[PDB]
Amino acid sequence: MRECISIHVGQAGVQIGNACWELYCLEHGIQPDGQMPSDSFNTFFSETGAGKHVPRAVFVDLEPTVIDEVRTGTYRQLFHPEQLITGKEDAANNYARGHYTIGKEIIDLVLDRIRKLADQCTGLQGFLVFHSFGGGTGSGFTSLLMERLSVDYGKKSKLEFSIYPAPQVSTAVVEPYNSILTTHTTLEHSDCAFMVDNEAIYDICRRNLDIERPTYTNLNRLISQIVSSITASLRFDGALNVDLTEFQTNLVPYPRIHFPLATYAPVISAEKAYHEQLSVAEITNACFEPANQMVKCDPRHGKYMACCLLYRGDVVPKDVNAAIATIKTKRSIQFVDWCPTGFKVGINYQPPTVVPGGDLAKVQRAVCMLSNTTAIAEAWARLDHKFDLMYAKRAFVHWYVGEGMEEGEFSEAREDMAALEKDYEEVGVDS
Amino acid sequence: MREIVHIQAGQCGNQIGAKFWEVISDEHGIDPTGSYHGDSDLQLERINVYYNEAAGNKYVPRAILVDLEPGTMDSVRSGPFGQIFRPDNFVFGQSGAGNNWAKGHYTEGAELVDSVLDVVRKESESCDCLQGFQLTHSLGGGTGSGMGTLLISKIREEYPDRIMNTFSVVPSPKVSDTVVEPYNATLSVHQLVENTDETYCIDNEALYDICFRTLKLTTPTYGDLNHLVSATMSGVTTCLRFPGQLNADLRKLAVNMVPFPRLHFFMPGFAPLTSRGSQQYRALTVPELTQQMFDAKNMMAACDPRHGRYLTVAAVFRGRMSMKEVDEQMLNVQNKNSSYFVEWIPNNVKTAVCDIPPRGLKMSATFIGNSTAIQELFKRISEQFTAMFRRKAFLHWYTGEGMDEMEFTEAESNMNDLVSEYQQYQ
């Protein structure tokens, strides 16, 4: 049937992929050794040998430590040994290294592995890519890989779950350079990009889950929950099914505006589950509050272009219609005038599954919400500002130039980013 | 004598068809295995209208299930009443239209239409006296709208003198299920208005209203909505399978409902509709059925007929009744509500009576009205279309499939033309 291929690159991508594959194995009842103790999961797992299910995944990094952690973990006997590809020297937070110097050494091997995995599929629908903007390997190799993919396939859809840089929290100094360069070179080679912020997830964990020590495991578990809710309609059946193509058809009004924001509900802890009834109306309301968005940007500062809702479990379509109508009448949210109908809904029968030892309580229904809004324009502006601050004095430029990146490229990227900002300002004005 | 071929496109069409075939099989006394286990000879008297006959008493419904993605009818095959269908009638694609009208009309439909037409032709060759075709689809999705329009065009080319009925699901006025839903709808009508003999418009919001307010259902699912739609579908064509005092087949309904070729959109209804808590508080009679049929609340399209004037009306009664009662009820309704009927057509109503009641009910009635008020819905859609096409929103998705903006301009112009005609005739 329809098959999806997952690619995880860099430290963030690899760890998010680990969490995602643990979640899939738990949801489908597959043991960590590839055996089923007791079948629509052909979308993600292929059958090899006698009852062994191998995930359709590719794990790429230029540094072997995190992949080595994978190879010795609980899921050692789950992944194909050749699907875990490693380099020797990482990009070292240098976009040019992961794009021009180090990326080109293993890009061909990665493409060969992807082709071998894809030729098996008969109904391939698209690619899932997990990476981060700030990292060198992430941004550089992801940009190179998507350029190669768009050249090779073109028609198949390509999706990203990227980590947007936080407004205040940062873990690198060269972050704006890499972010701007990779956004400029990936703007024309993508179909939909869902972005999350570590700071926003920290706020979510502190405010709702009541966790004071949210390590990266919890963040990756939340992200994996969102990805699972996105792919559920493929992996199961419901009253209203949505595949990957409908996402880009409904959320992307123009080819240069494909940066929606992903939220989730209900994110509550075990003890507060007793005091709350998780009804469709209230979780739909919670999906639209600014305090629940997992990117540090206020929706009230802009207008929604398109919205997509995905419901799981015990859900009645009439309640969904009523809740969406109630949201529409409310004037706390704003919609562009040129988009009279701004909702795409999907309903699935399979309820979410709670990973044992986790932090989320057990619920019978859940909502995943994606919004394409101009409120992200502000974030773009901020990044550009930082770029300028560090480019008026040529700070750190020699590091990139010594790796084969001509200086004018930086200007090009900045110029393009400015144009993109103008784009948003043009579509945020009603007629 | 006559026989009807059923077509089934898209997810909405497939689910409605599954419910419809379950209802039909239960009506004729056929178990899910396809073996007749009824009690009355009238079940087999005209069973050839919908079911073939295979060696061994097994009955194969004369249906074709089409989709561009395999999930929906994979579930259909796995679930109950999946072994009843002949597996050669399941036509699947791998990609799926992705809510893109152009993709389902020019690229994927272009690939699947040859196989679908081969199946249709093979199924219809065994027909003795083909009466027409039935199609179930929705105007919002890509697969439904695009491939349905393509199939309808090809069939109308192949069988110009036959009958085509469509049970469409028109977009709701309050809450949409798709962002690009305006575009497709308009692009659909520009074909439908030219190729379909009659179309019955169904709105999900009206069905929600009926289920909540009248049936008192707290949790109405798509199962109940498709149950109601299947009840209407069965009521429409009941005169072809059972004897009655006054008969009416598809051709006669078409003759009575299209004063002009470009106006073939009607709003269906049903009666009686009561819950399991208040059904013993009301005695159902012909006046009760008539009063429930002529209720703006009971209409299955979210469009108030009181804002316009009826052109023609059809009432199909089921059960044992008195012709005098039906005639006096129609005369009374026409006299009281004479402000909602066009003056240039006397005796707007056409009645049919079928002796055999629905299995379990004492009596029932199906209402089909051709009101000018539908123009409202039409103009609303046009408005939204313009609100997008002024800014070229989502236009690249369609134009990357080979379509050009002149097609959108033509569709909008024809849409406005139809709205103007509906306004003039009022």
Partner: peptide, 10 residues
């Protein structure tokens, strides 16, 4: 983006 092209459409 060419969102201003068809604003003159009737």
């Amino acid at each position: 983006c060419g969102s201003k092209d068809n604003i003159k459409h009737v």
